[PDB]
Scaffold this motif. Structure first.
Motif, PDB file in Angstrom:
ATOM      1  N   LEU A   5       0.834  -1.206   0.000  1.00 38.15           N
ATOM      2  CA  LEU A   5       0.000   0.000   0.000  1.00 38.15           C
ATOM      3  C   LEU A   5       0.876   1.266   0.000  1.00 38.15           C
ATOM      4  O   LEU A   5       1.716   1.412   0.901  1.00 38.15           O
ATOM      5  CB  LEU A   5      -0.920  -0.015   1.229  1.00 38.15           C
ATOM      6  N   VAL A   8       2.024   3.723   3.637  1.00 39.78           N
ATOM      7  CA  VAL A   8       1.686   3.120   4.926  1.00 39.78           C
ATOM      8  C   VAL A   8       2.643   1.965   5.197  1.00 39.78           C
ATOM      9  O   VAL A   8       2.982   1.200   4.287  1.00 39.78           O
ATOM     10  CB  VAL A   8       0.216   2.636   4.967  1.00 39.78           C
TER      11      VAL A   8
ATOM     12  N   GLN B   5     -21.763  20.955  10.286  1.00 36.90           N
ATOM     13  CA  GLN B   5     -22.684  19.891  10.679  1.00 36.90           C
ATOM     14  C   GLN B   5     -24.107  20.261  10.271  1.00 36.90           C
ATOM     15  O   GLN B   5     -24.454  21.443  10.195  1.00 36.90           O
ATOM     16  CB  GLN B   5     -22.584  19.655  12.201  1.00 36.90           C
ATOM     17  N   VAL B  11     -32.393  17.458  10.071  1.00 32.95           N
ATOM     18  CA  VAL B  11     -32.061  16.033  10.209  1.00 32.95           C
ATOM     19  C   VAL B  11     -33.357  15.219  10.298  1.00 32.95           C
ATOM     20  O   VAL B  11     -34.275  15.613  11.045  1.00 32.95           O
ATOM     21  CB  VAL B  11     -31.172  15.810  11.450  1.00 32.95           C
ATOM     22  N   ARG B  15     -32.346   9.608  13.155  1.00 31.51           N
ATOM     23  CA  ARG B  15     -31.035   9.528  12.509  1.00 31.51           C
ATOM     24  C   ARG B  15     -30.057  10.502  13.165  1.00 31.51           C
ATOM     25  O   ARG B  15     -30.453  11.560  13.659  1.00 31.51           O
ATOM     26  CB  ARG B  15     -31.121   9.854  11.004  1.00 31.51           C
ATOM     27  N   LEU B  16     -28.755  10.131  13.161  1.00 30.16           N
ATOM     28  CA  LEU B  16     -27.689  11.005  13.650  1.00 30.16           C
ATOM     29  C   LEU B  16     -27.335  12.061  12.589  1.00 30.16           C
ATOM     30  O   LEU B  16     -27.530  11.825  11.394  1.00 30.16           O
ATOM     31  CB  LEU B  16     -26.446  10.177  13.989  1.00 30.16           C
ATOM     32  N   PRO B  17     -26.818  13.236  12.983  1.00 26.13           N
ATOM     33  CA  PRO B  17     -26.406  14.224  11.972  1.00 26.13           C
ATOM     34  C   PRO B  17     -25.100  13.850  11.282  1.00 26.13           C
ATOM     35  O   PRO B  17     -24.252  13.152  11.842  1.00 26.13           O
ATOM     36  CB  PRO B  17     -26.246  15.517  12.781  1.00 26.13           C
ATOM     37  N   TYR B  48      -6.703  11.054  -2.277  1.00 24.77           N
ATOM     38  CA  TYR B  48      -6.285   9.786  -1.686  1.00 24.77           C
ATOM     39  C   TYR B  48      -5.853   9.980  -0.231  1.00 24.77           C
ATOM     40  O   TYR B  48      -5.315  11.024   0.145  1.00 24.77           O
ATOM     41  CB  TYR B  48      -5.138   9.192  -2.514  1.00 24.77           C
ATOM     42  N   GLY B  50      -4.058   7.307   2.786  1.00 22.62           N
ATOM     43  CA  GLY B  50      -3.583   5.961   3.075  1.00 22.62           C
ATOM     44  C   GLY B  50      -4.304   5.306   4.240  1.00 22.62           C
ATOM     45  O   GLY B  50      -4.587   4.107   4.207  1.00 22.62           O
ATOM     46  N   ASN B  51      -4.587   6.076   5.293  1.00 23.38           N
ATOM     47  CA  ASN B  51      -5.174   5.494   6.498  1.00 23.38           C
ATOM     48  C   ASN B  51      -6.591   4.987   6.246  1.00 23.38           C
ATOM     49  O   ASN B  51      -6.984   3.940   6.775  1.00 23.38           O
ATOM     50  CB  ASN B  51      -5.163   6.515   7.634  1.00 23.38           C
ATOM     51  N   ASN B  53      -7.794   3.862   3.384  1.00 31.15           N
ATOM     52  CA  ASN B  53      -7.628   2.636   2.617  1.00 31.15           C
ATOM     53  C   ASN B  53      -7.190   1.484   3.516  1.00 31.15           C
ATOM     54  O   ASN B  53      -7.705   0.366   3.405  1.00 31.15           O
ATOM     55  CB  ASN B  53      -6.609   2.900   1.506  1.00 31.15           C
ATOM     56  N   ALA B  54      -6.251   1.751   4.429  1.00 36.94           N
ATOM     57  CA  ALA B  54      -5.739   0.710   5.315  1.00 36.94           C
ATOM     58  C   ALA B  54      -6.820   0.195   6.263  1.00 36.94           C
ATOM     59  O   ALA B  54      -6.935  -1.015   6.490  1.00 36.94           O
ATOM     60  CB  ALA B  54      -4.536   1.243   6.097  1.00 36.94           C
ATOM     61  N   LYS B  55      -7.611   1.102   6.848  1.00 35.99           N
ATOM     62  CA  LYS B  55      -8.615   0.680   7.827  1.00 35.99           C
ATOM     63  C   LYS B  55      -9.819   0.013   7.165  1.00 35.99           C
ATOM     64  O   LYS B  55     -10.339  -0.981   7.687  1.00 35.99           O
ATOM     65  CB  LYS B  55      -9.054   1.875   8.675  1.00 35.99           C
TER      66      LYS B  55
END
Ligand SMILES: Nc1ncnc2c1ncn2[C@@H]1O[C@H](COP(=O)(O)OP(=O)(O)NP(=O)(O)O)[C@@H](O)[C@H]1O
Ligand SMILES: Nc1ncnc2c1ncn2[C@@H]1O[C@H](COP(=O)(O)OP(=O)(O)NP(=O)(O)O)[C@@H](O)[C@H]1O
Ligand SMILES: [Mg+2]
Ligand SMILES: [Mg+2]
Ligand SMILES: [Zn+2]
Ligand SMILES: [Zn+2]
Lengths: 51, 81, 92, 656, 567, 364
Positions: A5, A8, B5, B11, B15-17, B48, B50-51, B53-55
């Motif tokens: 990736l 990362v 918000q 709302v 439902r949550l906002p 893009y 990275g975090n 995509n990783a999670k």
DNA sequence: TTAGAGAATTGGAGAGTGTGTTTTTTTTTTTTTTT
DNA sequence: ACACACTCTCCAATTCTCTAA
């Protein structure tokens, strides 16, 4: 994370020996890829809704 | 940067906002204060990350709003009245 | 905070049932009182602020103090509930 | 880069070692052990430095010079484990008995590998792979004595001692569970069908991945290596921690501790809460790899265990060697052991003989019982002392705390019902919940002493109810739901209500205990301080003598020392004497009288509550304890009448 | 003919047949190879049967299936702390209690490759955890390097799960706390076991290295250890049915069963009877609307000290298939029901579902903790609403409680409700309430003294309170079968008697719950005789036992005190 | 059956007491798998050698076992177009375009050569197939192909292409010359056609058509397949001429057999029909001609195991009838030879030996 | 038809280079001071 | 400084081609 990736770093045993992994170890998770959802839980609009 | 918000009156029930984040540049900084109800025009933009995509484990991009404009005395007649 | 919805949020435009109300801590009865006063919920902590709508009707059950009702006494004497909360039920 | 001279040459010491192993005797001592090793009968060799000192003295008296090997292996202990092992391997004799050699995988592998080399021809493997034994040093006897014989507290272990063999005194705080550690690893090459080995010393290693064998290389055979457990060598490993005694901590400081490592047959010797004299080798722990380059010169350190000496022999450790037999025969032949043993408890306290006799029976205890349907009945005895201020209650209680091999002392105000029993602590930083046993668990299979029992809170005292009768603890809290074992006998002390006993009220008003708790003590002794010109004079003459001489005054009576007393009690706790019909009829008839008398007098000033069925089993337990002390296998009516007398005497203080 | 794939095998049969006496030892010393040999033997034998006996079954179907042996009863069980490094890769046997199970993990078994340029595909076998990726694409005209690639969702996987097993208290060292070990389990056995289960297992004792960091091949010197299970066991015939039906025909059945649940305890017959009916239980009922109605019975034992209450709780705790024993000062509100940890975790009443929960020293726990029991006893459900979790759980749990009165010995100068001292909303939820009293009497005392002293005439006693009692195993069989197969219904006669009896107790205090508990007790009595109908006799026994438990006949009807002379 | 980390270890001992090691649970029971798995670990493969460029995709350089796909209306409309073309246009078109090219052959370019040879081929084959199917169709519609001028021209193209070592035109010309022969056998199964045969099978052409499979060994999989099908037709015509023994001995030698095996071992890719053709030829070499010594060579013996195993050819395809009926006879004759003269054990690895004094007894 | 002398193409051995690494709640059991 | 990923380079192994016996 264990694959290449961009931007990362890398993070019960997995599988290894694949080209992209080098000496690293790979595991997997199960999830469901759905295609539609249906719920099961003005008077004129209501009357038009009824049979 | 400013976090925006949904107004509670808009709302739907049960439902949550939702949230979004806005970038303010040269002339627009400190145009608004926390807790104000505000109206914004701008470009909707993405990049893009990275975090994310990783999670999430899917090729998922992040999005932001770049503001172009932001929105929220008496006469002699009033004084005489 | 985890933000995730509580019981009164799920019961928006609905009926919320509280059983053995008299056992609830005062520190939490006041939270229900504040929500019932406004039909609104407020969050402000850790740099995150939010306001939410709670148009929910409450149905509650309780025990008289000592387990049996006293015909010599008012309902206020019989029930372990504070007067502002008691003032906000339409029917007993 | 540079080099120095030193006074020691290891060739001379190696020659001394190989002479010592084949010559010393108290045939030679160590060759019998090596024969047992060769026969696969024995797993470890314990070297005694007293032997080496004796050997040196004998060689000197024969008119010849010899190196001081004893100091030489104390000063630099690590190196000599290897020298002794090489000597043992060199001098090992052949087996005396058939072995069934084919049970060994390593034998088959090495035989086939040798045959491969033999065919090919038409060190091989590391010697550690075939050492079937472990080796340890035992320090010098202090009565012959040198630093290894003299205990150090955990503060005195300075950086000077790194590398040496030492002895440490303290309390164990925690113990790990056993897991394997590698010593020699074994691999297989797929293409050329050949095996290779690797030896591991550091905390980490890199496994091999290429077959570098010359034959495999010259056949250009770049085969793959794979690991194998079935021909690898492991050894058992365990890690513990020791901490200094609380009564040796200097004021305003926090206690210090050491990490202990244990390998081989020495594993699972230590246990938490033990007071112990550990001895071993004190060493540093170097860093590895990139960490070492930026860790600096500060070194972590630990102790390699070699031998362990406990302060008090637990009763479960008893076996009747003739050395012990000879000593118990002294007491048996002398006779009247009951009175002598009771009189020997705390000789510096005058009188109080019946109280001491009751506390001796507490030390012995009844017989555990378990019925064929699964019901079980308590064997332990519970005792309580109730009396005026200034009559040596706390003093006598704390004296019995010395005799028992497992025991703890606690006071009512300093104690939580939780910490007295067991606690569920959110102890780690990881938010994990862990159970940690209290005082009554640490006193498992021992005595628990509770002083100031009347000051403890009424709610907290209820925690003791389950432990007293069922000898177990049950907990159901956040993330934890288990039962623990607590086979402990309780001894407690209290003042009556208003302090000094009040004769205007009944005994039950003065005692001020609830019925469910008052029943759980087998004996409650009531002792009152009533002046008398005659008795006060005798007591004062006794106490003043003790302050003058540090010795109890004596004309006729010699107490048995605590060690021989422990041997006799430990021997006596093995007997399990049975009842008989003649005895059963007598106690059955006694019980009826007790309940009828109780019913008659529930109104009376002389009342003490009502006799429950737990008072019958109290008589049986006291009777069986008396039968144990006379080393019998049968309860006698002589025991029952004494057991009834000892219960009757507890109430006579009410009658001045 | 049943279409099934696994064969049990107790290893003692290998010692009986002369040709396999040595194979028994080889199995323990080399499990991985020997078990594989056995598998490929069984499959071949199954094929041989259909081809030799020339039967109609599909050869392809049998060739497609996998067949597995599962050896068990291998030898003596081994203490969890006493496994040593010389036991690695040998077969082991363990006893213990299950703490928790992780969710199913997918484990890869076959890899699937596809060529990026020419779309050639290859299936590859996984062994020793390593994927044997090809160097070049194997199609003759597309012999190119780095040309193949893996397709995750076209691979083939298998189920793996990890179970956490805890040491049983029978083995723990003196003054210490129990340990635990982890079991790896695959395919058929995956979801077999729940929290609080008690089992015995059989599997290879394994060890493996662990890495210092995820970047490099550097290993640590200490090795991890675990167990690789191949079999699990929990700790019918027409002869059993014949024995059960024959026993059910005895005249003294009710007394026989009652005196046999706790053989060494002297008298206390009514207490034993009530506990027996709690073991059988009522009938469970569910409607299309109007809810569901509990079959379970709640019992409270209250009275003087030394009366042997806690000894009775021991027997019930060991007889019941599922259940828990606990103490008043040992229990928190969370520990008794469920615990937030973000995940939810089970407490005592949840582990005890479908069983009996024994609570001792009930009078020591606080009003805060006891208030939790109201909802669980009335509804048999647990509702939770805390940060991040909101749900309702089922708790079909029977409570057996033990307590001593206020003042710690029963005071005859106070009314019964004031001696018991539980608040009315909680006291109203028990089906049976017992008063037991330490009354002095020479006749009683001589018998009790002779009974207790007789246990000490032998080293390990053979003596027992009565000539005729049933063994625990057979009694368990009777109770279990009757719970499964028998479902009594109300007869019109029983309806008339129940209405009459309730009006009798009511007109004079009896609440509406006295009616429902009477119905439930009568149903429990009917099951115990293997009847399909509730009759007048059953209703009258249910009434009689309620009146007997709370000493009603000796009660002053106006003042509420008990005349001790009438006891 | 059990998972990938359960696996034990296996050791296998040879004669002379030397031992090998292999892993996995199936190796414990299946020696065939263990032997195969043992060799499969080894790293090396010998690196390998490789014919056509300059022109658009066609039958000459693509695997044609892959159709293109038609609507029903399209299928019937296309069938109608080319059917009316054949019944109407084909002879008049070919007669003109051929009597052009005889006057212009020297000036040609590679594409026009490869067009002409793959228009001829298609239409002749399609008509033969159509009249094989049904009586409404007739062969007279394509009959312009046979008259003498066109026969000379296809011959001349093949000749000139072969001499200059232009392998793509040689490939197409091979395909065209195949069909002409196929059409001749059709018409003989009904005067001038025998004259045309006699001129087609002058000695010069037999030298060429015998030469052609020998060079096929190096080239792509289609080239060898063209060689095989042409050879089958070429021999079958001369069988029904009745010379024959001269011609058949001309074909039988080592470099033809090499091509046949080199083609046969890629059977996973080939049709059911082509393997029928190869074993027809081996029946001709082995049984009829009684030149047994050619096929005693080891890489044939490997092949019959692969293909005949539960691995390869299906248990019920028609191929297994032919293959097992061949191998039975093969091994019977091999048994006889080996016991009569034990030197053939070392013979079986190598090519046969061309010395005068020993070689004659070797071959027989 | 064999074979041997010379030229061209390819593989991978192995040598070299650069790089990365240590390191505000919310829920639940327990002790302590505060009304 | 210690395992890794990636790049660069040279050398000889191999097959192809031409010539003459
Ligand atoms: N019989 C005795 N012989 C010797 N010393 C005695 C005797 N009786 C009392 N004493 C002395 O009394 C002192 C106090 O003893 P101690 O054990 O503290 O009393 P206590 O029973 O615990 N009183 P208290 O804690 O106030 O209830 C000690 O110094 C003893 O030496
Ligand atoms: N009827 C009886 N049968 C058998 N044992 C009895 C009987 N009555 C009393 N005992 C004995 O007396 C003791 C009773 O202990 P226990 O079971 O704790 O009674 P309990 O009712 O729980 N008393 P407590 O815990 O003080 O409220 C045990 O040793 C029993 O064996
Ligand atoms: Mg004191
Ligand atoms: Mg009890
Ligand atoms: Zn090798
Ligand atoms: Zn490809």
């Amino acid at each position: 994370t264990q694959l290449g990736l961009p931007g990362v770093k890398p993070s019960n045993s997995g599988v290894t020996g694949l080209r992209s992994l080098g000496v690293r170890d790979l595991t997997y998770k199960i999830s469901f890829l759905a295609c539609h959802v249906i719920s099961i839980g003005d008077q004129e609009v209501f009357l038009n809704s009824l049979s | 940067r400013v976090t925006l918000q949904e107004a509670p009156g808009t709302v739907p029930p049960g439902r949550l906002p939702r949230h979004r984040e806005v970038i303010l540049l040269a002339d627009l900084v400190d145009v608004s204060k926390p807790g104000e109800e505000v109206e914004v025009t701008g470009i909707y933009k993405n990049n893009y990350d990275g975090n994310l995509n990783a999670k999430n484990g899917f090729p998922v991009f992040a999005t932001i709003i770049e503001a172009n404009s932001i929105k929220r005395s008496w006469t002699e007649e009033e004084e005489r009245e | 905070v985890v933000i995730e919805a509580g019981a009164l949020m799920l019961a928006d435009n609905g009926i919320c049932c509280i059983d053995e109300f008299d056992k609830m801590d005062i520190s939490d009865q006041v939270a229900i009182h504040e929500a019932m006063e406004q039909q609104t919920i407020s969050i402000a902590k850790a740099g995150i602020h939010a306001t939410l709508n709670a148009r929910t009707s409450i149905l509650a059950a309780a025990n008289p103090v000592g387990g049996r009702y006293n015909r010599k006494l008012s309902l206020r004497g019989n029930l372990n509930m504070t007067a502002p909360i008691m003032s906000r039920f339409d029917l007993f | 880069l540079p080099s120095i001279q030193l006074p020691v040459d290891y060739n001379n010491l190696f020659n001394e070692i190989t002479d010592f192993l084949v010559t010393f005797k108290q045939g030679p001592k160590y060759m019998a052990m090596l024969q047992k090793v060769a026969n696969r009968e024995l797993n470890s060799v314990i070297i005694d430095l007293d032997d080496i000192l004796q050997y040196q003295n004998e060689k000197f008296l024969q008119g010849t010079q010899a190196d001081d090997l004893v100091s030489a292996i104390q000063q630099n202990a690590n190196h000599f484990t290897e020298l002794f092992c090489r000597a043992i391997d060199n001098n090992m004799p052949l087996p005396t008995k058939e072995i069934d050699y084919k049970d060994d995988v390593l034998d088959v592998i090495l035989n086939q590998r040798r045959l491969r080399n033999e065919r090919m021809l038409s060190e091989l493997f590391p010697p550690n792979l075939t050492r079937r034994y472990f080796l340890y040093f035992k320090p010098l006897s202090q009565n012959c004595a040198a630093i290894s014989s003299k205990p150090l507290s955990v503060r005195q272990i300075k950086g000077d001692f790194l590398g040496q063999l030492i002895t440490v005194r303290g309390i164990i705080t925690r113990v790990s569970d056993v897991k394997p550690a590698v010593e020699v690893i074994a691999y297989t090459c797929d293409q050329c069908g050949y095996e290779v080995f690797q030896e591991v010393n550091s905390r980490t290693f890199t496994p091999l991945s290429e077959c570098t064998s010359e034959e495999c290389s010259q056949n250009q055979t770049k085969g793959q290596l794979f690991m194998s457990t079935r021909a690898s060598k492991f050894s058992a490993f365990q890690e513990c921690k020791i901490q200094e005694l609380s009564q040796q901590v200097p004021v305003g400081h926090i206690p210090r501790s050491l990490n202990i490592h244990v390998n081989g047959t020495l594993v699972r010797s230590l246990s938490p809460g033990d007071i112990v004299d550990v001895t071993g080798i004190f060493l540093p722990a170097p860093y590895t790899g990139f960490k070492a380059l930026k860790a600096g010169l500060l070194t972590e350190t630990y102790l390699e265990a070699q031998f362990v000496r406990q302060h008090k022999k637990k009763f479960a450790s008893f076996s009747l060697t003739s050395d012990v037999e000879e000593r118990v025969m002294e007491l048996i032949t002398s006779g009247d052991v009951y009175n002598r043993l009771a009189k020997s408890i705390a000789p510096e306290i005058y009188g109080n003989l019946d109280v001491k006799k009751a506390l001796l029976l507490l030390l012995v205890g009844g017989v555990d019982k378990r019925v064929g349907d699964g019901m079980k009945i308590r064997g332990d005895i519970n005792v309580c002392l109730m009396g005026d201020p200034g009559v040596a209650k706390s003093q006598l209680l704390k004296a019995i705390c010395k005799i028992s091999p497992r025991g703890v002392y606690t006071t009512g105000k300093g104690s939580s019902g939780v910490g007295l029993t067991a606690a569920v602590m959110k102890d780690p930083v990881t938010d994990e919940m862990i159970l940690e046993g209290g005082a009554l668990v640490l006193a498992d299979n021992g005595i628990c002493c509770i002083d100031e029992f009347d000051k403890m809170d009424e709610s907290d005292r209820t925690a003791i109810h389950e432990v007293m009768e069922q000898q177990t603890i049950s907990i159901s809290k956040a993330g934890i739901n288990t039962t623990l074992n607590a086979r402990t006998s309780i001894l407690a002390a209290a003042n009556p209500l208003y302090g000094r006993y009040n004769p205007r009220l009944s005994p039950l008003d003065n005692i001020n205990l609830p019925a469910a708790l008052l029943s759980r003590f087998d004996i409650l002794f009531l002792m009152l301080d009533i002046p008398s010109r005659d008795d006060d004079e005798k007591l004062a003459e006794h106490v003043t003598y003790v302050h003058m001489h540090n010795k109890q005054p004596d004309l006729d009576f010699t107490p048995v020392e605590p060690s021989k007393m422990r041997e006799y009690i430990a021997y006596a706790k093995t007997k399990r004497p049975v009842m008989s019909e003649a005895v059963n009829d007598y106690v059955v008839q006694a019980y009826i009288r007790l309940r009828q008398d109780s019913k008659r007098e529930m109104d009376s000033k002389f009342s003490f509550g009502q006799a429950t069925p737990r008072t019958l089993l109290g008589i049986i337990r006291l009777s069986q304890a008396l039968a144990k002390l006379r080393l019998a296998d049968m309860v006698d009516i002589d025991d029952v009448e004494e057991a009834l007398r000892l219960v009757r005497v507890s109430k006579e203080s009410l009658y001045q | 003919e049943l279409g099934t794939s696994n064969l049990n095998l107790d290893a003692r049969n290998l010692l009986a047949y002369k040709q396999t006496e040595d194979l028994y030892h080889q199995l323990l010393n080399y499990p991985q190879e020997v078990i594989s040999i056995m598998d490929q033997t069984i499959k071949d034998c199954m094929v041989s049967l259909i081809v030799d006996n020339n039967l109609d079954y599909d050869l392809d179907e049998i060739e497609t299936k996998f067949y597995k042996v599962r050896p068990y009863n291998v030898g003596s069980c081994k203490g969890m702390r006493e496994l040593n490094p010389n036991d690695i890769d040998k077969l082991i046997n363990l006893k213990g209690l299950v703490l928790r199970s992780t969710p199913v993990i997918p484990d890869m078994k076959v890899a699937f490759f596809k060529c990026n340029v020419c779309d050639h595909t290859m299936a590859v076998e996984i062994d020793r955890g390593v994927i044997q990726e090809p160097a070049r694409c194997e199609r003759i005209d597309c012999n190119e390097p780095n040309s193949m690639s893996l397709i995750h969702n076209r691979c083939s996987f298998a189920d793996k799960q990890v179970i956490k097993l805890q040491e049983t208290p029978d083995f723990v060292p003196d003054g210490q706390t129990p340990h635990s070990i982890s079991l790896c389990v695959y395919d058929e056995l995956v979801d077999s076991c729940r929290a609080g289960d008690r089992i015995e297992v059989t599997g290879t004792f394994r060890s493996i290295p662990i890495r210092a960091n995820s970047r490099q091949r550097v290993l640590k010197s200490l090795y991890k250890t675990y167990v690789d299970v191949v079999h699990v066991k929990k700790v019918i015939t027409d002869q059993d049915l014949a024995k059960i039906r024959e026993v059910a025909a005895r005249e003294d059945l009710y007394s026989l069963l009652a005196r046999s649940i706790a053989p060494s305890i002297y008298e206390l017959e009514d207490v034993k009877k009530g506990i027996l009916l709690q073991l059988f239980g009522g009938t469970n009922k569910t409607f299309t609307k109007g809810g569901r109605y509990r079959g379970d019975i709640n019992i409270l034992l209250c009275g003087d000290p030394s009366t042997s209450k806690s000894q009775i709780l021991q027997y019930v705790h060991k007889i019941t298939p599922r259940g828990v024993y606990t103490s008043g000062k040992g229990s928190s509100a969370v520990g008794l029901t469920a615990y937030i940890t973000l995940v939810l975790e089970s407490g005592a009443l949840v582990l005890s579902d479908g069983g009996v929960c024994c609570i001792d020293e009930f009078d020591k726990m606080s009003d805060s903790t006891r208030s939790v029991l109201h909802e669980v006893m009335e509804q048999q459900t647990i509702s939770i609403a805390k940060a991040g979790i909101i749900t309702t759980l089922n708790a079909r749990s029977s409570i057996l409680a033990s307590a001593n009165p206020i003042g710690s010995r029963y005071n005859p100068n106070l009314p019964v409700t004031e001696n018991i001292d539980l608040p009315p909303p909680l006291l109203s939820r028990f089906d049976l309430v017992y008063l037991v009293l330490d009354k002095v009497d020479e006749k009683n005392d001589r018998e009790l003294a002779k009974h207790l002293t007789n246990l000490y005439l032998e080293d390990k006693p053979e003596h027992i309170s009565q000539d005729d009692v049933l063994p625990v195993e057979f009694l368990t069989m009777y109770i279990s079968y009757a719970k499964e197969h028998i479902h009594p219904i109300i007869t019109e006669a029983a309806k008339t008697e129940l209405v009459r009896a309730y009006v009798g107790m009511r007109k004079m205090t009896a609440t509406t719950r006295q009616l429902e508990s009477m119905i439930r007790l009568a149903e429990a009595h009917a099951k115990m005789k293997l009847k399909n109908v509730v009759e007048l006799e059953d209703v009258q026994e249910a009434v009689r036992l309620i009146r007997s438990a709370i000493k009603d006949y000796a009660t002053d009807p106006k003042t509420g005190k008990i005349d001790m002379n009438l006891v | 059956a059990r998972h990938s980390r359960f696996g034990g270890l296996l050791s296998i001992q040879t004669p002379d007491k030397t031992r090998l090691t292999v892993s996995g649970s199936q190796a414990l029971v299946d020696e065939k798998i263990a032997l195969q798995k043992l060799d499969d670990s080894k790293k090396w493969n010998k690196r390998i050698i490789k014919a056509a460029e300059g022109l658009p995709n066609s039958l000459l350089n693509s695997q044609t076992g892959k159709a293109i796909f038609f609507t029903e209306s399209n299928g019937k409309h296309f069938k109608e177009f080319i059917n009316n073309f054949i019944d109407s246009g084909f002879n008049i078109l070919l007669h003109s375009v051929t009597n052009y090219f005889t006057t212009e052959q020297d000036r040609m370019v590679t594409l026009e050569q490869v067009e002409y040879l793959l228009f001829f081929a298609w239409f002749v084959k399609y008509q033969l197939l159509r009249s094989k199917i049904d009586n409404s169709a007739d062969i007279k519609q394509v009959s312009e192909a046979l008259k003498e001028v066109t026969f000379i021209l296809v011959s001349s193209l093949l000749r000139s292409a072969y001499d200059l070592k232009n392998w793509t035109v040689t490939h197409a010309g091979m395909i065209a010359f195949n069909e002409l022969l196929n059409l001749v056998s059709r018409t003989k199964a009904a005067t001038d056609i025998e004259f045309i045969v006699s001129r087609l099978f002058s000695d010069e052409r037999i030298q060429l058509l015998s030469n052609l499979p020998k060079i096929g060994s190096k080239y792509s999989l289609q080239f060898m397949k063209s060689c095989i099908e042409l050879t089958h037709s070429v021999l079958k015509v001369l069988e029904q001429y009745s010379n024959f023994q001269k011609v058949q001995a001309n074909y039988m030698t080592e470099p033809v057999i090499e091509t046949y095996i080199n083609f046969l071992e890629r059977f996973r890719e080939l049709e059911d029909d082509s393997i029928k053709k190869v074993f027809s030829f081996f029946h001709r070499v082995f049984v009829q001609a009684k030149e047994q010594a050619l096929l005693f060579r080891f890489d044939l013996i490997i092949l019959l195991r692969e293909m005949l195993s539960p691995d390869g050819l299906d248990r019920m395809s028609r191929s297994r009838k032919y293959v097992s009926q061949f191998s039975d006879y093969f091994l019977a004759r091999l048994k006889k030879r080996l016991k009569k003269s034990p030197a053939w054990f070392v013979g079986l690895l190598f090519p046969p030996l061309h010395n005068s004094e020993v070689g004659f007894y070797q071959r027989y």
